[PDB]
Amino acid sequence: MESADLRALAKHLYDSYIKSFPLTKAKARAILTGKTTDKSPFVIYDMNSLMMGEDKISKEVAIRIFQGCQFRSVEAVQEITEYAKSIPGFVNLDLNDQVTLLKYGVHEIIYTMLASLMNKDGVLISEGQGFMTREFLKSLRKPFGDFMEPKFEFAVKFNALELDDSDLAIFIAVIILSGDRPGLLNVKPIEDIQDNLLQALELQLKLNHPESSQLFAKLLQKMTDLRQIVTEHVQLLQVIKKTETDMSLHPLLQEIYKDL
Amino acid sequence: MESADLRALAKHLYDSYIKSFPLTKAKARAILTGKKSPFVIYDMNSLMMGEDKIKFKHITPLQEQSKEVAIRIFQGCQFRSVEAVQEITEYAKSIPGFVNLDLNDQVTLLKYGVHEIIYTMLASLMNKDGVLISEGQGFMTREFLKSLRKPFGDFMEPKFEFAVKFNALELDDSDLAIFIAVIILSGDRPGLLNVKPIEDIQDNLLQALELQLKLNHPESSQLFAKLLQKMTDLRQIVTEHVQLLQVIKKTETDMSLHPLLQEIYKDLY
Ligand SMILES: O=C(O)c1ccc(-c2nn(C(=O)c3c(Cl)cccc3C(F)(F)F)c3ccc(Cl)cc23)c(OCC2CCCCC2)c1
Ligand SMILES: O=C(O)c1ccc(-c2nn(C(=O)c3c(Cl)cccc3C(F)(F)F)c3ccc(Cl)cc23)c(OCC2CCCCC2)c1
């Protein structure tokens, strides 16, 4: 609750975030804007560029891309879980509430952090080694094309806030420590942690974006749109599963989606 | 370098050690010796009453957990160990020079060090008759732990065997604060990128521990050497520990936790 303490918490979370997520927004942005020789991605914009891309960096292409999304989402769940344990107080919570917070929080976080990998033309893949175009993703057949596009729609709006990794590290923590998740046993300790995270985010945004009016409020308003987009994602994903048999969901994602 | 620098480092680490860990050795020993009473778990019925009266957070039934007591206690060890890792990680940041290391090397040092540190610090909570749990609110007997069925009983006992020998050195919290730092700053962990600064810090921690032990146990002959020799018992039992855990997972079908819980505890299983 004191500034030094709030700045210390910000530094802690940023450092843990760097340790936990291999591909930061800062690195993604350097790749997307370029001007460098060594970091240029191979761009996948059609079927044949995809073929060449596998040789550089079976199933029907839409499915293969879906399985690529879910395999990375599972890895992201693992990275997010490691990050969560570094949030002060999280591992001391009731073990059931830890599961619950991760269960309902990972999806919102994956959307947030996916945006870091995206611009209006596509998304970085394979640790930034590839770039798959939005138009290619959107043109995937039957339900898959429309499954991909809303991730871009959110990302373009979220990215206009110009958050950097130091901002995102605290924002992600706030999302995880949401006391309103269904089935929480002890709301008060989660809310006490979140108030400290919210206080730290508030000061971080004031110091890092002093010219950005009410960025704190605008970012909390983004957490609202995240709740709606994750809801649409699950409903669409359920429909796809009840139509496509060639789709396995990783048992970790399978568990997260059950009862959700 | 100089005596004052080494004493300052000792005091800095001691002060941080107190801040980082919930139950110090000094407080634990007062409880173990009877100097009010912790709730005592000595059999199945006292365990049931103890979880119902006291809230032993690591041995409370989860959803999708084994109801078998031996498994529940085993997993409780793993859940507390997860908590200890974060405590050790926070302590590490207070060691002068540590946060300036390469971030990958900070991660590596903590990764390969926490097991040795958890064993070491567990000894502070243990005597030959049992172990303090829940910040000293409970005391679980060695006989109860050792009498758990199949491999679980034999998984518990080696921890007591080590602790009893380690505790004969009669280290206090000011000694342990430096010793634990020395363990973290081990230059021989696999995959370190820049060993030189890690050994430079460890050499300072070693000088500080050597002087600490001379001043705090002037009558304890070659205590510095005997404590470094305990790295032999520590490296060996962590090795044994890994083999034991493997047998349990490749044998026990009733160990299922919610996959998100499995992910949280993934480095300790
Ligand atoms: O690296 C990451 O951090 C990363 C993170 C996320 C995705 C991703 N997840 N995702 C989902 O639907 C999804 C979500 Cl958001 C949350 C949870 C579960 C899922 C799902 F299980 F259902 F999969 C996308 C849809 C559209 C798009 Cl463009 C991306 C995703 C991701 O994409 C990897 C590559 C996409 C292009 C082809 C090659 C692989 C990468
Ligand atoms: O408070 C602490 O600082 C504390 C510290 C350690 C333990 C502990 N760790 N441990 C391990 O096996 C272990 C080790 Cl040493 C190193 C690394 C990882 C593990 C493991 F992940 F595999 F778990 C025990 C075995 C036997 C016994 Cl008696 C204890 C431990 C500890 O136990 C708490 C339990 C509460 C419920 C009732 C039973 C004791 C508490």
XYZ file of C-alpha atoms and ligand atoms in Angstrom:
609
model
C 0.000 0.000 0.000
C 3.042 2.310 0.142
C 4.637 3.455 -3.135
C 7.994 1.720 -2.677
C 6.092 -1.476 -1.862
C 3.880 -0.988 -4.919
C 6.881 -0.351 -7.179
C 8.641 -3.372 -5.653
C 5.624 -5.541 -6.441
C 5.606 -4.228 -10.017
C 9.279 -5.106 -10.478
C 8.729 -8.570 -8.958
C 5.865 -9.363 -11.307
C 7.674 -8.046 -14.383
C 10.795 -10.082 -13.609
C 8.716 -13.228 -13.022
C 6.767 -12.561 -16.209
C 10.022 -12.350 -18.203
C 11.119 -15.609 -16.622
C 7.800 -17.349 -17.351
C 6.864 -16.334 -20.877
C 9.534 -16.982 -23.524
C 8.154 -14.505 -26.104
C 7.514 -11.029 -24.711
C 5.541 -8.281 -26.390
C 8.795 -6.321 -26.710
C 10.380 -9.134 -28.731
C 7.188 -9.705 -30.734
C 6.967 -6.007 -31.641
C 10.615 -5.916 -32.802
C 9.834 -8.865 -35.070
C 6.565 -7.389 -36.399
C 8.003 -3.969 -37.260
C 11.307 -5.365 -38.431
C 13.943 -3.125 -40.006
C 16.285 -5.960 -38.936
C 17.816 -8.772 -40.994
C 18.140 -11.445 -38.284
C 14.603 -11.582 -36.872
C 12.504 -11.650 -40.042
C 9.714 -14.280 -39.916
C 8.665 -16.604 -42.690
C 5.156 -15.553 -43.742
C 2.395 -18.133 -44.287
C -0.413 -16.667 -46.381
C -1.694 -19.682 -48.379
C -1.497 -23.461 -48.687
C 1.889 -23.595 -50.449
C 3.590 -21.058 -48.170
C 2.401 -23.313 -45.345
C 4.070 -26.289 -47.050
C 7.344 -24.385 -47.482
C 7.038 -23.061 -43.921
C 7.063 -26.526 -42.362
C 10.245 -27.314 -44.304
C 11.880 -24.053 -43.109
C 10.779 -23.406 -39.505
C -2.427 -36.294 -43.037
C -5.119 -34.000 -41.583
C -7.066 -31.234 -43.345
C -5.389 -27.837 -43.091
C -8.099 -26.192 -40.975
C -7.793 -28.995 -38.414
C -3.994 -28.861 -38.456
C -4.105 -25.140 -37.705
C -6.688 -25.692 -34.968
C -4.495 -28.354 -33.381
C -1.645 -25.869 -33.574
C -3.747 -23.314 -31.658
C -4.715 -25.803 -28.961
C -1.186 -27.164 -28.569
C 0.146 -23.621 -28.030
C -2.794 -22.772 -25.763
C -1.877 -25.763 -23.573
C 1.718 -24.563 -23.395
C 0.432 -21.099 -22.549
C -1.659 -22.632 -19.736
C 1.593 -24.135 -18.413
C 3.448 -20.843 -18.649
C 0.547 -18.990 -17.020
C 0.430 -21.541 -14.208
C 4.140 -21.021 -13.537
C 3.612 -17.251 -13.572
C 0.621 -17.532 -11.218
C 2.685 -19.323 -8.587
C 5.044 -16.357 -8.455
C 2.211 -13.961 -7.597
C 2.704 -13.196 -3.864
C -0.008 -14.946 -1.871
C -1.295 -17.174 -4.687
C 0.349 -20.449 -3.610
C -0.766 -19.797 -0.026
C -4.432 -19.821 -1.023
C -6.707 -22.806 -0.529
C -5.623 -25.401 -3.079
C -9.143 -25.678 -4.540
C -9.258 -21.918 -5.126
C -5.883 -22.005 -6.895
C -7.353 -24.505 -9.359
C -10.496 -22.393 -9.690
C -8.601 -19.145 -10.321
C -6.420 -20.764 -12.981
C -9.396 -22.623 -14.459
C -11.379 -19.452 -15.149
C -8.429 -17.145 -15.661
C -6.207 -18.833 -18.238
C -8.530 -18.192 -21.186
C -8.736 -14.431 -20.563
C -4.973 -14.350 -20.156
C -4.342 -16.290 -23.362
C -6.417 -13.786 -25.334
C -4.553 -10.881 -23.700
C -1.130 -12.312 -24.406
C -2.059 -13.539 -27.889
C -2.713 -9.875 -28.742
C 0.971 -9.195 -28.070
C 1.737 -11.532 -30.984
C -0.758 -9.940 -33.347
C -1.126 -6.897 -35.529
C -3.932 -6.150 -37.941
C -2.364 -8.412 -40.624
C -1.637 -11.632 -38.683
C -0.012 -13.461 -35.784
C 3.494 -14.608 -34.847
C 3.949 -18.384 -34.550
C 6.747 -20.806 -33.620
C 8.383 -18.476 -31.089
C 8.269 -15.661 -33.615
C 9.898 -17.714 -36.395
C 6.751 -17.577 -38.490
C 3.955 -15.135 -39.214
C 0.615 -16.499 -40.365
C -1.631 -13.968 -42.051
C -5.054 -12.962 -40.804
C -6.644 -13.360 -44.235
C -5.354 -16.939 -44.454
C -6.700 -17.784 -40.997
C -10.042 -16.099 -41.744
C -10.416 -18.037 -44.998
C -10.256 -21.471 -43.346
C -13.367 -23.444 -44.180
C -16.705 -24.105 -42.403
C -16.594 -22.992 -38.705
C -12.812 -22.621 -38.361
C -12.345 -19.323 -40.220
C -14.829 -17.476 -38.022
C -13.246 -19.104 -34.973
C -9.928 -17.364 -35.699
C -11.060 -13.851 -36.608
C -12.490 -12.674 -33.204
C -9.029 -13.140 -31.683
C -7.770 -10.536 -34.188
C -10.724 -8.229 -33.597
C -9.975 -8.130 -29.884
C -6.214 -7.832 -30.371
C -6.418 -4.713 -32.575
C -8.540 -2.936 -29.963
C -6.465 -4.140 -27.015
C -3.205 -3.195 -28.755
C -4.333 0.416 -29.212
C -3.718 0.890 -25.453
C 0.027 0.458 -26.164
C 0.707 -1.528 -23.000
C 4.187 -2.918 -22.583
C 5.259 -6.099 -20.818
C 5.763 -4.311 -17.492
C 2.126 -3.177 -17.659
C 0.859 -6.563 -18.821
C 2.649 -8.434 -16.028
C 0.472 -6.688 -13.414
C -2.685 -6.772 -15.554
C -2.402 -10.544 -15.956
C -1.929 -10.927 -12.202
C -5.098 -8.882 -11.567
C -7.084 -11.153 -13.900
C -5.908 -14.309 -12.109
C -6.767 -12.986 -8.642
C -10.427 -12.381 -9.518
C -12.537 -12.955 -6.408
C -15.740 -13.407 -8.433
C -14.840 -16.730 -10.102
C -17.562 -19.388 -9.685
C -17.058 -21.772 -6.781
C -14.420 -19.847 -4.820
C -14.324 -20.947 -1.189
C -12.459 -17.966 0.387
C -13.150 -14.772 -1.534
C -11.659 -12.365 1.043
C -7.989 -13.490 0.757
C -8.200 -13.396 -3.051
C -9.659 -9.884 -2.986
C -6.978 -8.669 -0.549
C -4.304 -9.817 -3.010
C -6.145 -8.255 -5.962
C -6.450 -4.879 -4.218
C -2.686 -4.798 -3.858
C -2.314 -5.829 -7.503
C -4.862 -3.194 -8.559
C -3.030 -0.524 -6.538
C 0.237 -1.564 -8.172
C -1.288 -1.497 -11.644
C -2.733 1.964 -11.008
C 0.669 3.418 -10.096
C 2.442 1.490 -12.867
C 0.101 2.979 -15.466
C 0.408 6.492 -14.015
C 4.217 6.354 -14.133
C 4.589 4.519 -17.438
C 1.802 6.299 -19.361
C 1.504 9.668 -17.594
C -0.038 11.249 -20.724
C -2.663 8.470 -21.070
C -5.845 9.755 -19.427
C -7.733 7.169 -17.351
C -5.705 4.312 -18.830
C -6.384 2.413 -15.600
C -10.164 2.612 -16.100
C -9.827 1.835 -19.820
C -7.810 -1.277 -19.031
C -10.393 -2.473 -16.467
C -13.035 -1.923 -19.158
C -10.971 -4.261 -21.383
C -11.254 -7.003 -18.739
C -15.000 -6.690 -19.304
C -14.770 -7.296 -23.074
C -12.522 -10.269 -22.237
C -15.315 -11.897 -20.240
C -17.628 -11.664 -23.258
C -15.103 -12.902 -25.820
C -14.151 -15.921 -23.705
C -17.868 -16.719 -23.403
C -18.298 -16.604 -27.173
C -15.124 -18.685 -27.599
C -16.421 -21.545 -25.412
C -19.813 -21.612 -27.129
C -18.215 -21.661 -30.565
C -15.676 -24.254 -29.445
C -18.421 -26.506 -28.057
C -20.275 -26.364 -31.396
C -17.099 -27.194 -33.307
C -16.389 -30.191 -31.070
C -19.973 -31.461 -31.484
C -19.447 -31.291 -35.339
C -15.777 -32.207 -35.950
C -14.715 -35.716 -34.935
C -11.142 -35.267 -36.173
C -10.583 -32.923 -33.248
C -8.970 -33.996 -29.986
C -8.768 -31.448 -27.199
C -5.736 -31.826 -24.957
C -6.892 -33.339 -21.623
C -5.708 -30.215 -19.780
C -7.916 -28.021 -21.975
C -10.626 -30.688 -21.811
C -10.709 -30.332 -18.003
C -10.629 -26.519 -18.103
C -13.656 -26.425 -20.408
C -15.799 -28.883 -18.424
C -18.390 -27.073 -16.297
C -17.198 -23.757 -17.787
C 36.790 -9.088 1.870
C 37.058 -7.572 5.376
C 35.523 -8.783 8.636
C 32.942 -5.975 8.725
C 31.848 -6.738 5.151
C 31.423 -10.411 6.038
C 29.499 -9.626 9.228
C 27.327 -7.157 7.305
C 26.531 -9.853 4.759
C 25.728 -12.299 7.573
C 23.366 -9.806 9.224
C 21.745 -8.833 5.907
C 20.995 -12.486 5.115
C 19.782 -13.235 8.651
C 17.366 -10.272 8.503
C 16.031 -11.422 5.141
C 15.847 -15.058 6.313
C 13.478 -14.021 9.142
C 11.323 -12.062 6.699
C 11.079 -14.886 4.155
C 10.208 -17.979 6.116
C 7.086 -18.397 8.270
C 8.587 -20.428 11.128
C 12.203 -19.893 12.192
C 14.357 -22.604 13.743
C 14.428 -20.685 17.042
C 10.639 -20.604 17.213
C 10.371 -24.214 16.019
C 12.804 -25.484 18.672
C 10.877 -23.730 21.452
C 7.772 -25.629 20.342
C 9.511 -29.002 19.904
C 11.182 -28.832 23.319
C 8.133 -27.630 25.239
C 9.484 -24.221 26.210
C 0.597 -23.430 23.920
C 0.738 -27.091 22.847
C 0.555 -27.834 19.112
C -2.174 -30.243 18.131
C -0.565 -33.698 17.970
C -1.233 -36.132 15.116
C -0.139 -39.586 16.270
C -2.646 -41.896 14.537
C -5.601 -41.865 12.134
C -8.139 -40.610 14.681
C -6.066 -37.612 15.808
C -5.515 -36.812 12.119
C -9.267 -36.735 11.487
C -9.892 -34.656 14.596
C -6.950 -32.398 13.734
C -8.083 -31.544 10.206
C -11.636 -30.982 11.528
C -10.502 -28.763 14.439
C -7.351 -27.110 13.070
C -7.423 -26.262 9.364
C -4.364 -28.139 8.039
C -4.571 -26.598 4.562
C -2.261 -29.123 2.898
C -4.071 -32.185 4.307
C -7.677 -31.077 3.618
C -9.659 -33.144 1.130
C -9.696 -31.709 -2.365
C -12.174 -32.456 -5.108
C -10.649 -35.195 -7.287
C -8.167 -36.397 -4.652
C -7.469 -39.785 -3.098
C -9.294 -40.435 0.154
C -6.499 -42.739 1.301
C -4.679 -41.093 4.180
C -1.167 -42.101 3.117
C -1.668 -40.488 -0.295
C -3.235 -37.383 1.264
C -0.258 -36.874 3.568
C 2.170 -37.498 0.688
C 0.502 -34.919 -1.508
C 0.436 -32.536 1.462
C 4.222 -32.737 1.560
C 4.261 -31.768 -2.121
C 1.823 -28.883 -1.665
C 3.856 -27.414 1.219
C 7.003 -27.891 -0.867
C 5.419 -25.726 -3.610
C 4.865 -23.003 -1.008
C 8.445 -23.331 0.225
C 9.797 -22.863 -3.325
C 8.201 -19.429 -3.532
C 9.583 -18.568 -0.097
C 13.078 -19.667 -1.092
C 12.730 -17.736 -4.392
C 11.889 -14.536 -2.508
C 14.810 -15.117 -0.124
C 17.178 -15.632 -3.072
C 16.454 -12.128 -4.345
C 17.855 -10.705 -1.118
C 21.248 -12.384 -1.632
C 23.607 -9.598 -2.814
C 24.419 -10.075 -6.485
C 21.686 -12.638 -7.207
C 19.213 -10.348 -8.980
C 22.066 -9.061 -11.189
C 22.740 -12.502 -12.578
C 21.433 -13.573 -15.941
C 17.734 -14.267 -15.573
C 18.062 -17.782 -17.017
C 20.792 -18.526 -14.471
C 18.614 -17.232 -11.610
C 15.927 -19.657 -12.773
C 18.411 -22.528 -13.094
C 19.979 -21.958 -9.680
C 16.563 -21.958 -8.006
C 15.394 -24.947 -10.073
C 18.283 -27.226 -9.054
C 18.683 -25.832 -5.545
C 15.215 -25.837 -4.010
C 15.259 -29.567 -3.226
C 18.460 -29.320 -1.184
C 17.152 -26.226 0.554
C 13.770 -27.732 1.404
C 15.419 -30.768 3.021
C 17.792 -28.524 4.961
C 15.063 -26.257 6.222
C 12.743 -29.169 7.008
C 15.327 -30.295 9.591
C 14.617 -27.072 11.482
C 11.035 -28.331 11.941
C 11.927 -31.871 12.949
C 13.247 -33.743 15.897
C 13.641 -37.498 16.300
C 9.963 -37.819 17.308
C 8.171 -35.814 14.591
C 7.658 -32.663 12.533
C 5.973 -29.294 13.011
C 3.297 -28.492 10.447
C 1.084 -25.494 9.669
C 3.510 -22.921 11.031
C 3.956 -24.906 14.211
C 0.247 -25.355 15.002
C 0.512 -29.119 14.640
C 3.064 -31.819 15.339
C 2.904 -35.053 13.360
C 4.766 -37.973 14.881
C 7.558 -39.825 13.107
C 5.942 -43.141 14.027
C 2.703 -42.091 12.350
C 4.476 -40.955 9.178
C 6.792 -44.012 9.140
C 3.823 -46.372 9.627
C 2.016 -45.223 6.478
C 1.512 -48.123 4.093
C 3.368 -49.394 0.970
C 6.170 -47.006 -0.140
C 4.804 -43.940 1.620
C 6.063 -44.878 5.076
C 9.550 -45.471 3.709
C 9.296 -42.197 1.762
C 8.823 -40.265 5.023
C 11.517 -41.839 7.209
C 14.691 -40.818 5.285
C 13.748 -37.176 5.873
C 13.842 -37.788 9.646
C 17.072 -39.783 9.337
C 18.777 -36.840 7.631
C 17.264 -34.199 9.899
C 18.466 -35.949 13.049
C 22.029 -36.028 11.747
C 21.882 -32.498 10.351
C 20.454 -31.199 13.635
C 23.420 -32.551 15.604
C 25.405 -29.646 14.147
C 23.132 -27.385 16.255
C 23.080 -24.616 13.671
C 20.907 -21.595 14.398
C 18.996 -19.298 12.055
C 21.934 -16.935 11.551
C 24.115 -19.874 10.437
C 21.412 -21.370 8.209
C 20.735 -18.063 6.456
C 24.243 -18.103 4.988
C 24.344 -21.873 4.437
C 21.144 -21.701 2.383
C 22.617 -18.825 0.343
C 25.722 -20.931 -0.319
C 23.507 -23.748 -1.643
C 21.646 -21.443 -4.039
C 24.834 -19.936 -5.461
C 26.153 -23.305 -6.683
C 28.200 -22.890 -9.857
C 27.885 -26.526 -10.944
C 24.157 -26.565 -11.740
C 23.498 -27.921 -15.264
C 22.912 -25.354 -17.956
C 24.329 -22.245 -16.277
C 25.413 -19.640 -18.838
C 27.792 -17.508 -16.740
C 29.353 -19.513 -13.908
C 31.987 -16.937 -12.929
C 29.734 -14.398 -11.105
C 27.919 -17.240 -9.321
C 31.163 -18.643 -7.918
C 32.341 -15.132 -7.006
C 29.211 -14.649 -4.916
C 29.451 -18.144 -3.439
C 33.059 -17.461 -2.448
C 31.850 -14.403 -0.541
C 29.051 -16.379 1.079
C 31.580 -19.069 2.023
C 33.915 -16.517 3.631
C 30.932 -15.162 5.526
C 29.764 -18.598 6.683
C 33.276 -19.541 7.794
C 33.562 -16.398 9.948
C 29.971 -16.772 11.218
C 30.665 -20.330 12.397
C 33.943 -19.339 14.064
C 32.261 -16.504 15.962
C 28.992 -18.282 16.766
C 30.408 -21.753 17.557
C 34.016 -21.028 18.588
C 34.138 -24.309 20.526
C 32.778 -26.407 17.627
C 35.918 -27.727 15.962
C 35.927 -27.615 12.146
C 32.193 -26.941 12.033
C 32.711 -25.175 8.688
C 34.182 -28.356 7.195
C 31.467 -30.542 8.757
C 28.718 -28.342 7.320
C 30.220 -28.425 3.814
C 30.396 -32.211 4.227
C 26.605 -32.108 4.694
C 26.395 -31.153 1.016
C 27.335 -34.796 0.486
C 24.330 -36.026 2.451
C 22.189 -33.368 0.724
C 23.207 -34.174 -2.830
C 22.797 -37.884 -2.119
C 19.405 -37.801 -0.482
C 17.926 -35.516 -3.165
C 19.167 -38.153 -5.631
C 17.489 -40.902 -3.587
C 14.356 -38.737 -3.324
C 14.017 -38.531 -7.117
C 14.273 -42.324 -7.481
C 11.672 -42.852 -4.741
C 9.212 -40.428 -6.356
C 9.605 -42.237 -9.697
C 8.727 -45.595 -8.135
C 5.579 -44.070 -6.587
C 4.298 -42.555 -9.846
C 5.095 -45.658 -11.923
C 3.269 -47.772 -9.315
C 0.379 -45.887 -7.682
C -2.857 -45.538 -9.675
C -4.708 -43.533 -6.976
C -2.476 -40.408 -7.291
C -4.780 -38.451 -9.586
C -5.219 -34.725 -9.025
C -7.023 -32.181 -11.176
C -4.612 -31.533 -14.112
C -4.265 -27.866 -13.143
C -3.118 -29.028 -9.709
C -0.743 -31.489 -11.381
C 0.667 -28.539 -13.316
C 1.171 -26.440 -10.155
C 3.033 -29.286 -8.386
C 4.786 -30.485 -11.554
C 8.390 -30.057 -10.416
C 7.923 -31.888 -7.085
C 6.341 -35.082 -8.505
O 1.804 -18.566 -28.821
C 0.810 -18.286 -28.115
O 0.846 -17.711 -26.998
C -0.549 -18.611 -28.660
C -1.662 -18.502 -27.843
C -2.914 -18.783 -28.347
C -3.073 -19.197 -29.673
C -4.446 -19.401 -30.147
N -5.344 -20.026 -29.401
N -6.546 -19.993 -30.092
C -7.688 -20.566 -29.539
O -8.624 -20.852 -30.247
C -7.699 -20.794 -28.064
C -7.555 -19.704 -27.206
Cl -7.341 -18.084 -27.815
C -7.571 -19.875 -25.831
C -7.724 -21.140 -25.309
C -7.885 -22.232 -26.140
C -7.858 -22.078 -27.522
C -8.052 -23.292 -28.389
F -7.813 -24.427 -27.747
F -9.308 -23.423 -28.813
F -7.256 -23.301 -29.463
C -6.418 -19.270 -31.275
C -7.309 -18.923 -32.290
C -6.828 -18.148 -33.328
C -5.484 -17.762 -33.355
Cl -4.869 -16.787 -34.672
C -4.594 -18.120 -32.380
C -5.073 -18.876 -31.311
C -1.937 -19.295 -30.502
O -2.001 -19.649 -31.829
C -0.927 -20.480 -32.293
C -0.892 -20.548 -33.803
C -2.151 -20.057 -34.500
C -2.027 -20.136 -36.017
C -1.674 -21.535 -36.466
C -0.424 -22.028 -35.777
C -0.543 -21.956 -34.260
C -0.688 -19.000 -29.990
O 7.120 -26.408 6.339
C 8.119 -26.720 5.641
O 9.142 -26.012 5.428
C 8.124 -28.092 5.039
C 9.158 -28.461 4.197
C 9.171 -29.720 3.640
C 8.147 -30.631 3.910
C 8.312 -31.975 3.352
N 8.731 -32.132 2.110
N 8.892 -33.492 1.903
C 9.332 -33.979 0.677
O 9.135 -35.138 0.384
C 10.062 -33.027 -0.221
C 11.280 -32.504 0.206
Cl 11.921 -32.929 1.769
C 12.018 -31.648 -0.599
C 11.511 -31.282 -1.827
C 10.299 -31.785 -2.272
C 9.571 -32.675 -1.483
C 8.254 -33.187 -1.985
F 7.695 -32.364 -2.851
F 8.344 -34.348 -2.608
F 7.367 -33.355 -1.010
C 8.616 -34.211 3.064
C 8.649 -35.573 3.369
C 8.344 -35.945 4.664
C 7.971 -34.973 5.599
Cl 7.563 -35.468 7.223
C 7.911 -33.631 5.307
C 8.250 -33.242 4.009
C 7.132 -30.267 4.813
O 6.123 -31.161 5.041
C 4.838 -30.598 5.332
C 3.828 -31.712 5.453
C 2.497 -31.150 5.923
C 1.438 -32.239 6.053
C 1.910 -33.368 6.946
C 3.221 -33.938 6.441
C 4.286 -32.854 6.345
C 7.104 -28.992 5.342
